[PDB]
Design a protein around this motif. Structure first.
Motif, short mmCIF file in Angstrom:
data_model
loop_
_atom_site.label_atom_id
_atom_site.label_comp_id
_atom_site.label_asym_id
_atom_site.label_seq_id
_atom_site.Cartn_x
_atom_site.Cartn_y
_atom_site.Cartn_z
N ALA A 297 21.88 75.42 102.96
CA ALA A 297 21.47 74.60 101.82
C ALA A 297 19.98 74.37 101.87
N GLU A 298 19.36 74.22 100.71
CA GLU A 298 17.95 73.94 100.68
C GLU A 298 17.56 73.27 99.39
N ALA A 299 16.44 72.56 99.46
CA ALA A 299 15.80 72.01 98.30
C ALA A 299 15.19 73.16 97.53
N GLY A 346 17.49 74.40 104.97
CA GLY A 346 16.34 75.28 105.01
C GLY A 346 16.82 76.71 104.95
N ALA A 347 16.87 77.26 103.74
CA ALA A 347 17.51 78.55 103.48
C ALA A 347 16.48 79.55 102.97
N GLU A 348 15.32 79.52 103.60
CA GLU A 348 14.21 80.36 103.23
C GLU A 348 14.57 81.79 103.54
N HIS A 349 14.53 82.63 102.51
CA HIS A 349 14.95 84.03 102.58
C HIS A 349 16.39 84.18 103.01
N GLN A 350 17.20 83.19 102.64
CA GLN A 350 18.62 83.23 102.92
C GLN A 350 19.31 82.96 101.60
N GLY A 351 19.97 83.99 101.07
CA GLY A 351 20.54 83.91 99.75
C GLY A 351 19.42 83.72 98.73
N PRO A 352 19.77 83.28 97.52
CA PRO A 352 18.76 83.03 96.50
C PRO A 352 17.90 81.81 96.83
N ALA A 353 16.68 81.80 96.29
CA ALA A 353 15.83 80.63 96.38
C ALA A 353 16.55 79.44 95.74
N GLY A 354 16.66 78.34 96.48
CA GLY A 354 17.42 77.17 96.04
C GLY A 354 18.89 77.21 96.42
N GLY A 355 19.39 78.39 96.77
CA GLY A 355 20.77 78.55 97.20
C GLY A 355 20.81 79.07 98.62
N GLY A 356 22.00 79.47 99.05
CA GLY A 356 22.18 79.88 100.42
C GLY A 356 23.50 80.56 100.69
MG LIG Z 1 17.66 80.45 100.00
#
Ligand SMILES: [Mg+2]
Ligand SMILES: Nc1nc(N)nc(N)n1
Ligand SMILES: Nc1nc(N)nc(N)n1
Ligand SMILES: Nc1nc(N)nc(N)n1
Ligand SMILES: Nc1nc(N)nc(N)n1
Ligand SMILES: [Mg+2]
Ligand SMILES: [Mg+2]
Ligand SMILES: [Mg+2]
Lengths: 364, 364, 364, 364
Positions: A297-299, A346-356
């Motif tokens: 999960a990420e902002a 913190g899903a940076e480069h994990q799934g879509p931006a804002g998603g995960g």
């Molecule tokens: Mg992501």
């Protein structure tokens, strides 16, 4: 590489609580020597100064060390401990224990079943965190973990968990003394860079991102680069990366299966329902076939969720990852019925931006 | 450029409280039209999402707007409002009000007395914050503020306060949509870059740093570059820089003087006492000759204070600037006898690394 | 009860770091079996969810357990571990280790020297925390600790450290299920009540407060009731009280002495200087004769410090104890030259309201 | 009492942003003189030191004051401003504006439509907050608000919003100086007591709780006492209670309706969907018929959610109300498709323990 994998979700009353694990051992339900990985959610803040991660690892290792008559330090080489702090909102502290035995004879079940492999990289220098070396070393370890799991192809790979380091002022000073600038001087931000580089390492190994595009300055910039399988978690308790690859193999006899998906954003409960369903779960009464859910999960970094502004990235009291875990922990809880699930922020480069990415483990 | 400067420290019970200022006006102690600057300490968190700064400004402007029959927005062009949030520890919320009238003829008396000038830059684009444009614009405004103050030379300059912007997710998205990378993508860190570039702007104008060394890549990197006069404070409430230059002028008839120094580190109370003593103040009953103290504080970026490790830069619950203000607020309070002093956090390129400039205003 | 006491201040790089202690053992400077108490400052938040306290205890116990071939749990009965979390501002994480051997023959030095005794109470029920039972049990343990120390009279008693419990929702539910209301339903506030009742227990045992006035409803209400010797610290890691009494005895041969004083408020550095001086320390060059300083700090409960309002009790992001430790840690650091000192927060019924007791240990 | 009610949800870019409201006025969509209440969600921390509530009120009042040529303070007597801070997770800052005009004659049409009435109590003394006076005064104001709304019976009442005070150290000192103990000495906890007493006031007026059981000692103790309609929010910006009663009236001609329900717990999205569906809304494209959702959320005080432990009441970095808003904001967002909804935290005596009432406003 013909395994039988067992998976146990055990509650924790506190970070040091190993009682749920003592009980599994003391009742013959799991053999200490077969345990190869533990993925935990501990109730520290999940950011830089969260020592609940190290504490949980230390106790688990001491607990297993007793039974195996090993030093804790030795157990930590044998078992992949990945402790993700931050159990905000309804998130309930717990460990997911993974045990591996040679394939329960033959006995080949009808289809592919859950398999799991682990790998480690070397310790990184402070100046390497968030950068090419961390990417390439991670890619390498992913591949070894895949091999160790007996995962035939990328198609059978469903989840790649990585634990990675972060920067402290001492580490920053050490980099500086060698004339090298660290990727950032902010310890919190270092976590994102470490997660991100690691995630891109997974994307490299999975051929989800062409090697050519993985330059240092693309880390945390290029939101389009990502792995839909990567789950990265940073921590102050280690200088290397720990990699757990989870997937499906014809050689595995586990009474368990895994599927994965992606949340398009923090509140995308639908995807979770959809992926759960794709494993034959058809009520709230069948939910107890799920052993656990593992999610990133990420902002949303554009500062918006479904058109509306959010404050998760502007809040200097509560860091974005803490908000994000609370939100997604809630979304998932509303689906599976409770908050004892693995949600990492913190899903940076994990799934879509804002998603995960997320994965689900269930009884066959 | 012949002025009489008055300075009033007034308590605030809350960020919107203008009652201390209404009292000065009602009792003939100050004329609304003469007020040229207010430097406040407001009890928000002093970081990104601190709207106590904007709230205080808005109310002060509305209060003055009534008396001058102006729109608040017009007052904000006439008066330099610099609100520094974050009143941790013993720091007591307050405003320091600066009024400027035509130089008194019935006295001076002899030598240089307190003077003050203000300047503004243009609004910066998000992508300019922390970078060369912000440096050069600030240098320019410092000069104009000097002129406006009537400060003969650099030697008579004792304090340069600059209010500067910071980055929000929206601003970051805006910079990105023009193909420009912001100096950072972390809103908290943006504050440091904004403060730092602004500080270097002051150092440029004071010839404390040669123009040649002020390249973008040196901002937050080269700790050797600094002004011993710069006090920078970032805020979400403005897109431009506000500059207040304070010093000593032969043309001023103020019953007030200013002296300055540097704290070598966050707990260097000694320097403060030493600079106070250089104004003939040496017992806690002479102390009430001090109108206020203005100080910069920061978490030592090497992660140590006098050889001992600190945790101010590793604490993800409480940001380093909040710690730093608490610490230095305390150090200063132990000297002057209370915490109603102006302490601002984040002293990048301001005084020594780990330390910060400060100034003292006292009765002649 | 004729002892030789040794005291060692050892740095910690993290809560689990026992390396400074391994070094003392491995170099023959201390014998594991002689260690009777450790007072630590750990870098968690020092409030409810701070498991750094338990983690440090667990590792120290495991470290000592190896050398003594004991189970950690057994070491925790033999050694008084008191871990006070919260190392805000300049406070540097560390342990103070106390070792006790039979008096180094005879050899009676010229005067009284440092002695130390420990005691434990039973586990408290949730409904007993903050209340009479906790007061009376503490009073009892203080007396036993005094005896164990060989402290002839109250006059020779210089410091009483107590570690005490706090309330969690589960503990609150447990109290409720027996028809008993807990002293509060707020877990943070429970810490103050636990500290306070414990402090009053010390005041009872020291005859600093008449037994008649110690009714439950006076806990946290009557600011006039206090011990000038009590240092209380609450924690989630225990259900009982741990008491360490430190003082002076003619039967002790320690090359160390202890004196105590009180800070009238959070920034009262003067008192600290005054008490240090009363042990013959007459420069900054003689400071290294101090082994450590132990101090209580708190947010003044009237909401004011030396006439000026503070925000420490109105800040919902940062709890008052965290502010208070930062402030007093700074004040003391400015005196002794660094922040590796024991400062604990929440000084309810400990010294004056807004202030707190402290003690200093120095070479004879 | 024949009204036409209009309701507008307007985004805010910051707490002081009135641009969305200026736009409604400029475009003839609403007349300044008709506005009777604004319910806002502002991006402060929602706890004690959240001045974003007061700042939003102040600006809205100034904005309306211009158009009505009134002093802001006069507008605040004419319009009920209820600002609930704390927009954690996906919660998006906004205002819900309520306007009331004489009932339309050219339509109604048939049956009951949205109506709304407002009332105020007197200022409370610090020592009255959380206690009987606050309960009885609130009950009274609820009735008057009902009358002002034209609500025939309790059955037509769907939502009662109350804004209430909280305790500061100064207020506590004031109560103490009159020999009266405040209900608590912890400012954060005071919010719960104020919300709770106010909620019980609503329950009294709605005959949902018999007067006999409403004793001071039951406030925050007896979880069985509650209103399924009460939404209470505490704030530092007022000394009295503001009551907005919302319901359905045959005399109203609004193109809007309101329905209500209760969340059994923080993640009970189901109830929300069930109540939404009871308005003929059943697909994410009909959703835009909803104007807004208004919901209470709280950390379950037994410390568990659906059998699993939560950490919301043990987290000293992040207060339980902040967690709770994040969680329930997420749960609701997953249903309506975004986080621009009114979620308030701390649901003491509001709906079930661990849950909270909510209401939905939709186009007829
Ligand atoms: Mg992501
Ligand atoms: N410990 C931890 N670290 C990260 N990066 N993310 C989460 N969720 N936990
Ligand atoms: N508001 C604010 N901004 C900064 N950068 N520093 C401080 N002390 N306050
Ligand atoms: N852990 C801890 N507990 C308290 N009560 N006070 C401090 N300073 N630390
Ligand atoms: N401002 C505010 N106050 C309370 N009590 N609850 C919420 N959600 N906001
Ligand atoms: Mg500096
Ligand atoms: Mg005290
Ligand atoms: Mg409730």
């Amino acid at each position: 590489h013909m395994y039988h994998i067992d998976v146990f979700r055990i509650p924790c009353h506190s970070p040091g609580d190993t009682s749920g694990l003592e009980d599994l051992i003391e009742t013959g339900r799991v053999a200490p020597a077969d345990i190869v990985a533990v993925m935990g959610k501990t109730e520290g803040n999940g950011c830089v100064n969260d020592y609940t991660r190290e504490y949980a690892t230390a106790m688990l290792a001491a607990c297993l060390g007793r039974h195996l008559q090993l030093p804790p330090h030795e157990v930590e080489k044998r078992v992949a401990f990945v402790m993700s702090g931050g159990t905000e909102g309804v998130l309930s502290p717990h460990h997911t224990v993974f045990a591996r035995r040679p394939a329960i004879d033959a006995h080949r079940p009808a289809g592919k079943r859950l398999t799991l492999g682990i790998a480690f990289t070397r310790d990184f220098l402070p100046e390497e965190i968030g950068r090419h070396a961390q990417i390439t070393e991670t890619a390498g370890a992913v591949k070894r973990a895949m091999r160790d799991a007996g995962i035939a192809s990328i198609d059978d790979l469903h989840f790649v968990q990585v634990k990675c380091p972060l920067l402290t002022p001492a580490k920053i000073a050490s980099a500086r003394s060698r004339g090298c600038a660290p990727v950032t001087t902010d310890t919190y931000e270092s976590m994102g860079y470490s997660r991100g580089a690691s995630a891109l390492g997974i994307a490299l190994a999975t051929e989800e991102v062409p090697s050519s595009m993985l330059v240092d300055e693309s880390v945390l910039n290029d939101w389009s680069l990502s792995s839909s399988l990567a789950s990265a978690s940073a921590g102050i308790e280690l200088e290397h990366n720990v990699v757990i690859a989870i997937g499906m193999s014809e050689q595995a006899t586990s009474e368990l299966v895994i599927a994965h998906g992606v949340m398009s954003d923090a509140i995308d409960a639908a995807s979770v329902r959809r992926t759960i369903e794709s494993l034959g779960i058809r009520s709230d009464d069948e939910m107890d076939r799920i052993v656990n859910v593992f999610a990133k999960a990420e902002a949303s970094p554009d500062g918006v969720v479904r058109g509306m502004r959010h404050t998760m990235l502007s809040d200097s009291d509560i860091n974005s990852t803490r908000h994000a875990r609370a939100v997604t922990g809630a979304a998932i809880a509303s689906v599976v019925g409770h908050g004892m699930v693995y949600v990492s922020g913190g899903a940076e480069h994990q799934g879509p931006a804002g998603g995960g990415p997320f994965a689900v483990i269930a009884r066959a």
